[PDB]
């Protein structure tokens, strides 16, 4: 349950890098992202490896590695 870095890249050219434990639910990362970006979680969708990220997935469960990148889209 070590730490790994994950980047979240949006369509506005920004990239936010987070450090997170392998067994921490990604829901926490997604919420932190929305809060710091001042975005509502309702109009945002996160994807990794072309697959939607559900609220219970963890980096470990998704076999994510250090420095992997998550895609985020604003459903506006």
């Amino acid at each position: 349950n070590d730490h790994i870095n994950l980047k979240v890249a949006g369509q506005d050219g920004s990239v936010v890098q987070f450090k997170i434990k392998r067994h921490t639910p990604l829901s926490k990362l997604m919420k932190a992202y929305c809060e710091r970006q001042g975005l509502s979680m309702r109009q945002i969708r996160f994807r990794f490896d072309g697959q939607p990220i559900n609220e219970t997935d963890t980096p470990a469960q998704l076999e994510m590695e250090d420095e992997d990148t998550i895609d985020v889209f604003q459903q506006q």
């Binding site: 870095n5 506005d12 050219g13 920004s14 990239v15 936010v16 890098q17 987070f18 450090k19 997170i20 434990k21 921490t24 926490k28 990362l29 932190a32 809060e35 710091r36 970006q37 001042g38």
Partner: protein, 215 residues
């Protein structure tokens, strides 16, 4: 009726007390800030939004809440130049710096947060004498003379700031300030999700800033 003495120039009182964790320092309060009687009124400034998106405030606060900050959040406000005149002297900055340093040496907050490189560049030359070569945002290698007060610099919260067009482009500095604040008080926050870095593309950021504006 009887008596017409309403003057144009108006002064926004500082919000300072002893034992504060943070003191937000600006160059000079805007005209509306002075007339409204509160710090960083909207629109056109990202301070209050950044305060919330960084987690420094529990809920989204606004200028009307500035007087509750010292007690609830350990945050205060002050400026280089005290008087706000409608529509920049060298002497003012000189006499201003002396008075500012004096207020800091008096109240001695844990952290002096400079709102914008400009204010710090002026302050640095007048107090430290140094001209600051290649200034970096964040914690500086100087404490306020005769105090244990740290100096922290972040981009200007004004929407006019061109280097960082959006509030989101400034939030990372507020997050790191929260971190510093926590470490100083011995508050052990959770290290489950840590924001290591924020990177942005200027062109897209300013375009995006414009779009958000028209809307």
């Amino acid at each position: 009726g009887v008596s017409e003495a309403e003057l144009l120039t108006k002064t926004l009182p500082d919000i300072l007390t002893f034992n504060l964790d943070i003191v937000i320092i600006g160059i000079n309060p805007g005209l509306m800030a002075a007339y409204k009687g509160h710090h960083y009124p909207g629109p056109g400034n990202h301070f209050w939004k950044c305060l919330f998106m960084s987690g420094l405030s529990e809920v989204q606060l606004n200028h009307m809440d500035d007087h509750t900050l010292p007690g609830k959040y350990g945050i205060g406000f002050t400026n280089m130049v005290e008087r706000t005149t409608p529509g920049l002297s060298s002497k003012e900055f000189r006499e201003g710096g002396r008075i500012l340093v004096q207020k800091l040496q008096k109240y001695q907050p844990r952290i002096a947060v400079f709102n914008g490189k400009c204010i710090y560049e002026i302050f640095s030359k007048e107090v430290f004498g140094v001209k600051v070569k290649n200034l970096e945002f964040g914690l500086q290698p100087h404490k306020i003379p005769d105090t244990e007060t740290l100096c922290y610099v972040m981009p200007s919260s004004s929407a006019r700031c061109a280097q960082f067009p959006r509030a989101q482009d400034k939030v990372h500095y507020y997050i790191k300030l929260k971190d510093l604040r926590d470490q100083l008080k011995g508050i052990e926050r959770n290290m489950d999700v840590q924001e290591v870095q924020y990177t942005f593309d200027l062109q897209l950021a300013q375009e995006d800033a414009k779009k958000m504006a028209v809307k």
